[PDB]
């Protein structure tokens, strides 16, 4: 998303209670809009929380943080969604699965997305690749989805530290590798010179 | 002035070509300066030939005892390494290419020929010597450049040589440092027969002020390509070819010990060492990649 | 030139054109249309040899035909690009860039 | 874990204390521990080293070797029968139960590799446990059990850079 962010933010700053509540049903039922971080952080939408349109805010929370199974568990409270919105939420659930592991078996996908046959799942993964949400390839024989690239959905202000917790884990990793080379290179010289020196001693005994 | 070398002085070249100082001394030409563009183009072409020998022409000029290579271009010829003066088959092509190159501002003329020795080192074979002798008889000043694309890749260091032949009957001086190279057994006989019929020039490289700037700025993104090299499978056929030759070298070194040259085993050991060291370096880059991108987790 | 390069680079094809300078201008569009007479969707590469900035002064563009004030006109849209992965090229480039034990 | 430390301690006591001839309970422990590690070549040569005086005075030692004969012949039902025959608390009894458990693990790991399909009675005799207990255990584990034929179908189950630098340092010099 990029154009839709500005296009809907312009309407978000110039909308009220009911208009915002219907705008949530309009942003969720629109192709390309998979991130709702800027829209959920709005004071105009914050007013809807714990108000007359609370379930719509909870629906936006599920679409920005939760999965399709979390929606199924709270379907009695949350407003009803069309096939397009159910699909979108399924795409985002596959993204969460892809964020967890690279190789997803069909069984985990069928259970998490609540699907019956393989083609439905395959068609949903196709719809994901087609909407530039996921990158990867499907393996029929081993019944597994190989994920090459998955987008970012969750913002997580409180859990943001975890990102740094992995980034530092990579940094330290580099800091080890780098030092490793520095040491190994030094050893590669430490041996060479030593050997040369030793050879120069052997060669000095030839005169005797 | 970094870019001074790029200035073309036509009258000065005509003056040098009319003077012919090389006729006064067969060791006149001692240095070979190659542009970064020509090196890259020749190495790219040499690699594109794979395990087959390819050849091309080099455009440039002369400056005192130095031969300067500014550019190069591939020749659509068959029989490089088997046909004496194989370049001759591309005569028409060469004339048109150069004519068209002059139309766009390539002023430098033919300075030499380059060809590849995939996996068998930089030197001149019997066919190469006949070809270069013809070129020095009819196309003087001319130089022969040999590249090993396979060894370049495997060693991570450019494997190139620049050579000039001696006229028929003329004997070389005491000079001949001869930097050691592993020569495969199917080539060593011919190498030995013709090794004293030519000499090696001192090679150096150059780039422009803009090339310097652009290469630093290229690095700011080109670093990614150094951590995604995959050298072990790119030219895997080289190490296998070398091992296939090494085995016959070891067969000869065994035959030397059998009954009864000067220590073939030590030569074969240095060859096997070099090949193995290159293989381990490949694994070193692979392990480095595994340490950086795989051993991270959630 | 095409008849010539096809003899030694048989597997290669004309993809677009290059020039030197700053951001794209009307002259580049005029020339791009002439290149469009040769190939359907050519790329346009621009190199700035007089750069003031810290990033590689190479930009690649595609041409888009848009409608501005009722006039259907040609414009350039910048594309992101990556550098090639050829081993021999990497070594050559590295050797050139460096220009000065086995491990 | 701790049995290996007691084995080394007994192996030290084997030569430090004598005197010519070592202590009989240490001989018993050393024999049973030599059976625990399946080192029958050490156990057979230990038993033949025992003087006939301790062989006659301490019959329990002969009762430990009677297990070894069955281990040497690889008769599993006989091993499980000979284990549950003698009692020598604190000294040999606490390690005989470890031998029984180790023989059970050894037999289970052997059947899981060496057999595709085996008779339930043969498998029960191989592990020592009765037919019902064995079939219950393997069905809980995941082996394919079949009635009538009484067949059980088993299911078969710098650190790196420094070494490389040493290899190149060797070849290059
Ligand atoms: Zn040659």
């Amino acid at each position: 998303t990029g154009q839709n962010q500005e296009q809907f933010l312009l309407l978000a700053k110039s909308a009220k209670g009911a208009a915002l509540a219907t705008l949530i049903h309009q942003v969720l039922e629109a192709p390309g809009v998979y991130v709702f971080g800027e829209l959920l952080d709005m004071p105009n939408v914050r007013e809807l929380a714990e108000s007359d349109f609370a379930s719509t805010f909870r629906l936006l929370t599920v679409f920005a943080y939760g999965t399709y199974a979390d929606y199924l568990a709270e379907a009695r409270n949350l407003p009803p969604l069309t096939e397009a919105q159910k699909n979108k939420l399924r795409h985002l659930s596959v993204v969460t699965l892809a964020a967890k592991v690279k190789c997803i078996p069909y069984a985990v996908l069928l259970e998490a997305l609540a699907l019956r046959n393989v083609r439905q799942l395959e068609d949903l993964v196709i719809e994901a690749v087609y909407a530039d949400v996921l990158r990867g390839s499907l393996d029929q024989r081993n019944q597994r989805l190989e994920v090459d690239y998955s987008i970012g959905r969750d913002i997580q202000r409180q859990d943001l530290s975890a990102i740094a917790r992995t980034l530092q884990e990579w940094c330290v990793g580099c800091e080890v590798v780098l030092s490793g080379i520095e040491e190994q290179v030094s050893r590669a010289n430490q041996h060479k010179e030593q050997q040369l020196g030793l050879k120069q001693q052997i060669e000095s005994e030839v005169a005797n | 002035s970094i870019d001074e070398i790029y200035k073309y002085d036509k009258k000065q070249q005509q003056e040098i070509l009319a003077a012919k100082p090389w006729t006064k001394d067969h060791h006149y030409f001692k240095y070979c300066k190659i542009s970064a563009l020509a090196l890259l183009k020749m190495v790219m072409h040499a690699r594109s030939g794979g395990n087959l020998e390819v050849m091309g022409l080099m455009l440039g000029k002369v400056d005192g005892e130095t031969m300067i290579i500014m550019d190069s271009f591939a020749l659509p010829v068959e029989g490089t390494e088997t046909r004496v003066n194989a370049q001759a088959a591309a005569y028409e092509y060469m004339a048109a290419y150069i004519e068209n190159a002059k139309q766009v501002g390539r002023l430098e003329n033919a300075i030499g020929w380059y060809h590849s020795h995939p996996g068998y080192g930089c030197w001149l074979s019997g066919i190469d010597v006949s070809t270069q002798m013809l070129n020095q008889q009819f196309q003087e000043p001319f130089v022969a450049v040999v590249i090993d694309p396979t060894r370049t890749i495997s060693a991570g260091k450019v494997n190139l040589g620049a050579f000039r032949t001696y006229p028929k009957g003329y004997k070389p001086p005491d000079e001949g440092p001869s930097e050691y190279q592993t020569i495969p057994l199917n080539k060593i006989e011919d190498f030995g027969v013709h090794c004293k019929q030519y000499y090696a020039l001192e090679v150096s490289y150059f780039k422009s002020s803009l090339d310097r700037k652009l290469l630093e700025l290229l690095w700011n993104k080109y670093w990614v390509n150094t951590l995604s090299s995959s050298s072990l499978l790119t030219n895997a056929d080289y190490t296998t070819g070398q091992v296939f030759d090494l085995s016959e070298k070891l067969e000869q070194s065994e035959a030397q010990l059998g009954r009864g040259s000067e220590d073939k085993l030590a030569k074969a050991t240095r060859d096997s060492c070099k090949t193995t060291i290159e293989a381990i370096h490949g694994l070193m880059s692979q392990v480095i990649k595994d340490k950086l991108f795989n051993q991270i987790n959630i | 030139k095409e008849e010539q390069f096809k003899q030694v680079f048989k597997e290669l094809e004309f993809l677009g054109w290059y020039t030197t300078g700053g951001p794209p201008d009307p002259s580049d569009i005029h020339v791009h249309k002439q290149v469009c007479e040769i190939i359907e969707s050519p790329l346009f590469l621009k190199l700035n040899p007089m750069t003031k900035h810290t990033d590689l002064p190479v930009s690649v563009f595609e041409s888009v035909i848009d409608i501005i004030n009722g006039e259907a006109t040609m414009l350039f849209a910048e594309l992101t690009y990556t550098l090639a992965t050829e081993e021999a090229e990497r070594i050559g480039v590295d050797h050139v860039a460096r220009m000065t034990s086995t491990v | 874990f701790s049995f290996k430390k007691l084995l080394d301690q007994c192996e030290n006591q084997e030569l430090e204390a004598p005197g010519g001839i070592a202590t009989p309970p240490v001989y018993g422990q050393l024999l049973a521990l030599y059976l625990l590690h399946n080192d029958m070549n050490n156990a057979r040569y230990l038993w033949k080293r025992i003087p006939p005086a301790i062989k006659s005075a301490n019959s329990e030692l002969g009762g430990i070797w009677s297990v070894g004969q069955r281990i040497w012949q690889r008769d599993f039902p006989g091993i499980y029968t000979t284990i549950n025959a003698h009692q020598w608390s604190e000294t040999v009894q606490p390690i005989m139960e470890a031998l029984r458990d180790a023989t059970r693990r050894r037999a289970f790991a052997l059947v899981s590799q060496a057999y595709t399909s085996i008779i339930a009675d043969d498998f029960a005799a191989f592990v020592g446990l009765p037919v019902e207990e064995a079939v219950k255990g393997i069905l809980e584990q995941g082996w394919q059990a079949d009635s009538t034929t009484r067949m059980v179908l088993p299911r078969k189950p710098e650190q790196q850079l420094a070494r490389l630098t040493d290899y190149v340092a060797f070849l290059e010099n």
Side-chain angles (χ1 to χ4, degrees):
Chain A
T1 185
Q3 168 66 20
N4 298 298
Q5 286 181 250
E6 298 138 35
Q7 195 81 0
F8 283 111
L9 200 81
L10 183 84
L11 286 151
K13 279 182 183 178
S14 300
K16 299 247 179 178
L20 287 153
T22 50
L23 201 74
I24 293 153
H25 291 101
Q26 289 299 293
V27 297
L28 301 177
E29 210 173 339
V33 199
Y34 292 89
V35 187
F36 318 102
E38 295 275 357
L39 287 156
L40 189 84
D41 212 56
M42 285 284 290
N44 301 48
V45 86
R46 279 173 188 173
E47 287 182 312
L48 295 159
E50 297 146 43
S51 192
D52 300 286
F53 310 97
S55 61
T56 58
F57 188 81
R58 291 182 220 271
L59 191 78
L60 199 65
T61 311
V62 172
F63 263 89
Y65 292 91
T67 58
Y68 196 81
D70 296 306
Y71 157 76
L72 286 162
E74 291 271 294
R76 292 149 284 176
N77 310 305
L78 300 159
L81 298 164
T82 55
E83 279 293 310
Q85 289 158 299
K86 283 172 179 168
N87 283 0
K88 280 185 79 190
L89 194 66
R90 280 164 174 169
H91 293 80
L92 300 162
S93 300
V94 182
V95 162
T96 317
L97 283 153
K100 286 272 197 171
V101 144
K102 216 203 96 87
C103 245
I104 326 294
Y106 285 169
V108 186
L109 282 147
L110 284 152
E111 196 69 72
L113 310 172
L115 294 155
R116 299 303 339 270
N117 59 68
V118 188
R119 163 90 287 103
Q120 284 168 340
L121 167 63
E122 281 186 22
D123 274 321
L124 282 164
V125 171
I126 288 161
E127 289 305 292
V129 176
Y130 285 17
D132 304 296
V133 192
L134 276 141
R135 286 270 174 268
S137 63
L138 298 109
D139 193 289
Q140 187 83 61
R141 193 192 284 273
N142 294 301
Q143 299 271 292
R144 281 177 173 274
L145 170 68
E146 284 170 4
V147 181
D148 287 335
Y149 164 73
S150 59
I151 60 133
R153 180 195 64 183
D154 287 55
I155 317 300
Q156 287 172 7
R157 189 194 48 79
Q158 198 70 54
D159 298 64
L160 240 151
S161 58
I163 300 144
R165 186 194 58 85
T166 49
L167 286 158
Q168 190 69 61
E169 191 188 21
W170 192 9
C171 252
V172 170
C174 302
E175 280 168 58
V176 175
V177 177
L178 285 153
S179 73
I181 312 145
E182 294 168 7
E183 203 75 35
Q184 298 305 320
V185 163
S186 187
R187 282 170 95 264
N189 298 297
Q190 189 66 72
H191 186 82
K192 185 74 190 162
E193 191 63 47
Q194 186 197 75
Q195 272 276 251
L196 286 148
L198 290 150
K199 201 183 186 290
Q200 289 164 341
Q201 286 160 35
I202 304 149
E203 289 169 315
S204 78
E205 295 300 313
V206 185
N208 292 330
Chain B
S1 182
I2 291 158
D3 306 323
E4 178 62 29
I5 195 167
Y6 290 84
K7 294 185 173 175
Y8 193 75
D9 188 350
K10 198 191 166 188
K11 193 174 99 164
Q12 181 235 17
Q13 281 303 291
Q14 288 170 317
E15 283 174 3
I16 297 154
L17 271 136
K20 308 173 184 187
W22 52 87
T23 60
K24 321 281 180 178
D25 179 9
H26 298 131
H27 58 71
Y28 182 78
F29 290 116
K30 295 177 183 67
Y31 312 106
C32 189
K33 280 184 191 159
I34 306 168
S35 73
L37 168 66
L39 166 66
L40 230 77
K41 232 201 279 182
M42 293 187 292
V43 169
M44 286 290 284
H45 181 218
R47 174 59 169 175
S48 92
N51 283 313
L52 305 181
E53 298 90 351
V54 294
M55 76 158 80
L57 206 76
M58 302 186 295
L59 301 173
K61 59 200 178 185
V62 290
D63 188 26
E65 303 178 305
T66 312
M67 309 199 73
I68 306 166
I69 296 141
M70 298 300 294
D71 198 17
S72 59
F73 59 92
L75 294 177
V77 304
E78 228 179 58
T80 297
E81 209 64 30
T82 63
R83 290 179 203 182
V84 178
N85 200 29
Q87 72 195 84
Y91 272 150
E92 291 206 73
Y93 293 64
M94 278 187 276
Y97 172 76
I98 293 169
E99 190 174 323
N100 290 309
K102 287 178 178 174
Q103 290 189 59
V104 291
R106 268 159 186 175
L107 308 177
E108 292 92 347
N109 291 308
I111 198 62
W113 70 294
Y114 74 97
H115 78 285
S116 59
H117 274 190
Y120 57 89
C122 304
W123 49 281
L124 304 185
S125 69
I127 291 95
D128 299 336
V129 170
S130 301
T131 301
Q132 187 55 20
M133 281 184 79
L134 270 164
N135 292 331
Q136 287 181 210
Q137 192 84 63
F138 300 99
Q139 268 195 92
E140 208 68 289
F142 222 72
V143 67
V145 157
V146 189
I147 305 171
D148 189 331
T150 320
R151 288 185 187 180
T152 295
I153 293 151
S154 67
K157 192 150 205 287
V158 185
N159 212 307
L160 188 150
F163 308 86
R164 270 181 62 80
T165 52
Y166 292 107
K168 198 181 182 192
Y170 178 71
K171 309 282 151 178
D174 330 300
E175 245 296 43
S178 184
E179 201 188 355
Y180 176 73
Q181 282 181 109
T182 298
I183 311 300
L185 298 168
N186 24 286
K187 307 278 183 185
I188 205 146
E189 287 251 26
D190 184 70
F191 169 79
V193 167
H194 306 273
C195 68
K196 296 298 165 204
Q197 297 174 5
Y198 59 86
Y199 68 92
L201 281 72
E202 186 186 286
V203 178
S204 68
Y205 305 106
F206 64 94
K207 66 190 181 189
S208 80
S209 58
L210 185 53
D211 291 338
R212 183 185 59 81
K213 279 179 274 188
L214 289 172
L215 292 155
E216 190 171 27
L217 301 176
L218 189 99
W219 181 261
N220 298 350
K221 211 137 188 219
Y222 211 77
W223 60 270
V224 176
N225 280 325
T226 321
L227 291 166
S228 54
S229 59
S230 190
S231 182
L232 267 159
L233 296 159
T234 308
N235 67 321
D237 296 304
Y238 165 68
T239 49
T240 74
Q242 284 285 288
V243 165
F244 230 113
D245 201 273
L246 192 88
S247 195
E248 18 158 34
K249 287 214 180 180
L250 282 161
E251 189 179 322
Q252 276 177 44
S253 72
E254 198 191 334
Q256 222 210 320
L257 288 161
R259 286 284 171 268
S261 53
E262 195 67 286
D263 205 26
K264 289 184 176 180
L265 192 67
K267 292 181 152 187
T269 302
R270 192 62 219 161
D271 309 334
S272 64
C273 276
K274 190 79 197 195
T275 319
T276 303
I277 287 159
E278 288 168 288
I280 298 164
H281 278 124
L283 197 75
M284 272 180 164
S285 71
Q286 302 301 317
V287 172
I288 276 160
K289 284 183 284 194
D290 182 88
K291 291 284 188 192
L292 282 152
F293 308 104
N294 310 346
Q295 284 176 245
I296 307 296
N297 295 294
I298 308 132
Chain C
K1 232 290 184 176
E2 182 190 64
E3 196 69 60
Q4 277 181 323
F5 87 73
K6 235 53 143 122
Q7 302 299 315
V8 290
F9 288 98
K10 318 160 200 162
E11 264 177 39
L12 290 82
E13 205 66 75
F14 187 40
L15 307 171
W17 73 292
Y18 72 80
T19 200
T20 51
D25 60 34
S27 85
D28 301 327
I29 293 136
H30 178 76
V31 173
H32 197 80
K33 209 271 160 195
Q34 293 170 61
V35 180
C36 285
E37 294 183 81
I38 303 165
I39 45 169
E40 293 123 305
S41 184
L43 288 175
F44 175 42
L45 187 145
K46 220 163 170 200
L47 191 142
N48 191 351
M50 303 290 282
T51 192
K52 1 213 283 178
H53 323 291
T54 59
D55 296 341
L56 183 71
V58 174
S59 275
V60 185
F61 307 89
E62 64 174 349
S63 48
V64 179
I65 156 119
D66 257 23
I67 301 167
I68 295 287
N69 294 299
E71 299 303 295
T73 197
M74 185 186 278
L75 301 167
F76 290 125
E78 187 168 14
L79 303 166
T80 54
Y81 67 92
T82 60
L83 298 168
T85 64
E86 172 60 275
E87 195 67 15
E89 203 173 20
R90 193 203 68 77
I91 291 152
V93 167
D94 181 74
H95 188 78
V96 165
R98 206 167 76 258
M99 257 160 72
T100 319
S101 187
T102 53
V103 174
Chain D
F1 181 77
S2 56
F3 308 96
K4 295 143 186 177
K5 294 151 195 177
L6 289 151
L7 174 71
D8 294 312
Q9 283 156 6
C10 280
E11 278 170 359
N12 291 322
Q13 285 176 320
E14 178 70 79
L15 301 153
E16 288 160 347
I21 301 136
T23 344
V26 179
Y27 277 146
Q29 284 175 304
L30 250 148
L31 187 65
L33 279 157
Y34 275 174
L35 300 172
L36 265 143
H37 297 76
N38 218 70
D39 206 316
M40 292 312 296
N41 297 307
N42 288 353
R44 190 188 169 184
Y45 280 108
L46 184 137
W47 164 257
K48 299 285 173 189
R49 189 165 74 247
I50 312 298
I54 302 160
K55 283 177 178 169
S56 61
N58 199 285
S59 59
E60 299 88 353
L61 190 88
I64 298 150
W65 172 251
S66 66
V67 190
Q69 294 166 330
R70 255 70 155 81
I71 300 153
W72 182 265
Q73 294 292 299
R74 294 192 236 187
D75 179 52
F76 287 87
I79 294 155
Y80 299 106
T81 309
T82 49
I83 286 160
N84 304 289
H86 60 87
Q87 283 86 58
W88 191 344
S89 61
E90 303 280 291
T91 318
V92 177
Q93 196 62 40
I95 57 173
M96 286 300 295
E97 293 161 72
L99 176 83
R100 191 197 68 239
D101 293 315
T103 310
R104 191 166 281 139
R105 293 196 288 272
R106 177 196 147 193
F108 197 86
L110 179 64
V111 176
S112 67
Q113 289 170 68
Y115 284 87
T116 316
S117 61
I118 186 163
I119 307 152
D121 309 291
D122 289 30
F123 171 69
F126 266 39
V127 295
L129 295 149
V131 193
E132 292 84 0
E133 189 110 52
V135 173
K136 180 193 75 188
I138 62 99
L139 269 161
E140 183 61 57
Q141 194 67 66
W143 292 16
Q144 184 64 72
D146 182 37
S147 61
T148 320
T149 51
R150 252 229 262 272
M151 293 300 290
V152 172
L153 290 122
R155 298 301 95 173
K156 202 170 183 179
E158 293 289 308
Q159 293 185 295
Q160 277 73 40
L161 277 160
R163 295 172 201 172
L164 297 157
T165 314
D166 288 321
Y167 304 144
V168 182
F170 174 84
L171 295 149
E172 182 216 335
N173 290 319

